[PDB]
């Protein structure tokens, strides 16, 4: 039975996303403990994403050098040990935690780049598609589990440190199993010149660049929200006269909204392709516009009620995540197969570069700049963070415009791809 390897890799990916988003739930505790402003809070996630984006292509290339199971297990052990060590960092030191987050990002990039190739090599059928679908559905569930685990451990233990201590141990329990229940596959296949030629061909392409910018905007919005929303909700609750719950609620909402958004995007694409051939970018653009509207609406109605904020977060995150299952189909319809893989790598770089990497530190810097100009108070800091996160709907609308431009150039670039393939 080869399904044991798929199951253990799926559990490992769940734990990977849990470890990635554990810091999100206890960002407030970390800020209170270390006596730092929002700049460091954003910088943690920024460094994590930067290390992830730098290391992912390197590990992807290294996966064809030696056995992938060994390097995958080594990366899992490395990031687990780094997190466990970071759980015991002295208060007066802050750069050590940043370096630990960078090392964890390196390990997570290694795992995320290596494991899907192993899963794809294990199965060659519709079962491969089903297993990849499960492995990728593990993402929102993993993020929700990370949020709720951080909240629950912080509440029960009484100290946030154990939040970084519970996850690594399971990783070891995972890693050994991966060292045992993952079969070894005996598979194999001008590199710089090929990269240069593919980059030159792709730059001249039109819809590909706009789609990459749109997914970069999506990554920007998702990173900023997933990094700052629980803290913003806690500040809003502090503002209200009424006296961990927010993190659990946001984790459950994140999981449910990710699954629902993927489902509704797939359904809208299925039931809208009959109208016209440009359904794939149009659905994404409509979802982005709706998500931007609801992201503005939550900040409009955050001060009034928290139930409305939860509902608006639910709807906005669903609409925002609706594009994840359609971006790949947009990409594979324009780029020719020979240059597809490289294209993905470039996108997997660009979406991280202009998007997820800069978003948390930019939001923190804007919030700090606004807060410095005014006397420090819970109301004023809440307003400053709200104004900082008000930049998200602007980026979401820009991504919607980019999706509209992709729809405009869709048919022309498809025709160019067809005539190049047949040439």
């Amino acid at each position, epitope marked *: 039975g080869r399904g044991a390897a798929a199951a253990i890799l799926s559990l490992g990916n769940v734990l990977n996303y849990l470890d990635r988003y554990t810091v999100a739930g206890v960002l407030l505790d970390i800020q209170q403990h270390f006596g730092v402003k929002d700049r460091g809070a954003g910088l943690l996630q920024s460094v994590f994403i930067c290390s992830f984006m730098v290391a992912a292509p390197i590990f992807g290339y290294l996966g064809d050098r030696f056995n992938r199971k060994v390097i995958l297990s080594c990366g899992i052990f490395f990031w687990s040990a780094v997190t466990f060590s970071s759980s015991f960092i002295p208060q007066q030191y802050f750069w050590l935690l940043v370096l630990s987050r960078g090392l964890v990002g390196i390990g997570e990039a290694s795992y995320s780049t290596i494991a899907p190739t192993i899963i794809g090599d294990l199965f060659t059928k519709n079962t491969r598609t089903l297993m990849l679908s499960v492995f990728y559905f593990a993402i929102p569930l993993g993020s929700g589990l990370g949020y709720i685990t951080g909240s629950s451990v912080k509440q029960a233990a009484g100290d946030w440190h154990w939040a970084l201590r519970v996850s690594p141990v399971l990783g070891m329990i995972t890693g050994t199993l991966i060292l045992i229940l993952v079969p070894a596959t005996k598979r194999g296949h001008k590199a710089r010149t090929s990269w240069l030629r593919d980059m030159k061909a792709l730059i001249r392409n039109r819809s590909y660049v706009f789609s990459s910018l749109a997914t970069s905007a999506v990554s920007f919005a998702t990173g900023a929200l997933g990094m700052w929303i629980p803290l913003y909700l806690h500040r809003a609750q502090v503002v209200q006269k009424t006296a961990a719950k927010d993190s659990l609620i946001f984790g459950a909402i994140t999981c449910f909204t990710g699954f629902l958004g993927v489902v509704t995007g797939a359904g809208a694409t299925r039931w809208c*392709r*009959l109208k016209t*051939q440009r359904a794939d970018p149009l659905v994404c653009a409509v979802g982005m516009l709706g998500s931007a509207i609801f992201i503005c609406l939550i900040f409009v109605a955050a001060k009034s009620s928290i139930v409305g904020a939860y509902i608006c977060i639910f709807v906005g995150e669903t609409l925002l995540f609706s594009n994840w299952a359609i971006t790949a189909d947009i990409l594979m319809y324009v780029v*020719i*197969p020979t240059r597809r893989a490289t294209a993905v790598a470039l996108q997997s770089f660009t979406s991280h570069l202009l998007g997820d990497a800069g978003s948390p530190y930019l939001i923190g810097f804007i919030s700090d700049l606004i807060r410095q100009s005014t006397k420090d108070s819970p109301l004023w800091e809440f307003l400053s963070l709200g104004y900082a996160l008000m930049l998200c709907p602007f980026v979401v609308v820009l991504g919607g415009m980019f999706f509209l431009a992709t729809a405009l150039f869709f048919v022309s670039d498809r*025709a160019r791809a*067809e005539q190049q*393939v*047949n040439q």
Partner: nanobody
Amino acid sequence: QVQLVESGGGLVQAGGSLRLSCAASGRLLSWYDMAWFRQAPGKEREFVAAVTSTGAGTHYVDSVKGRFTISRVNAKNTMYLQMNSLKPEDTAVYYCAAANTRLTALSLRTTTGSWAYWGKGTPVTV
């Protein structure tokens, strides 16, 4: 679910010109790469020509280049084929086929089995 209907095929005098129209109404035609095949009386199905989704790619046979033209219109949801200077060996039944669009070499896809969708087929006699 796409239904293909052929029209304009029939017996014609040698050396003339003819137009064949393949119409689809089940779904949108912009999602399908189309092609024409012929069933010779003494042979099996044979590839004739093919048109990609946007019409930017065309492939023919060594005995077909410079004699046949094939194109499509998605606004009217119909593909057309023009045959000129017909040879006596062209008397056969022609089938219009459509397949899910793929960014593969159109010339390499001439296996008469990859096209999951077929039509009624019309006989043309020279």
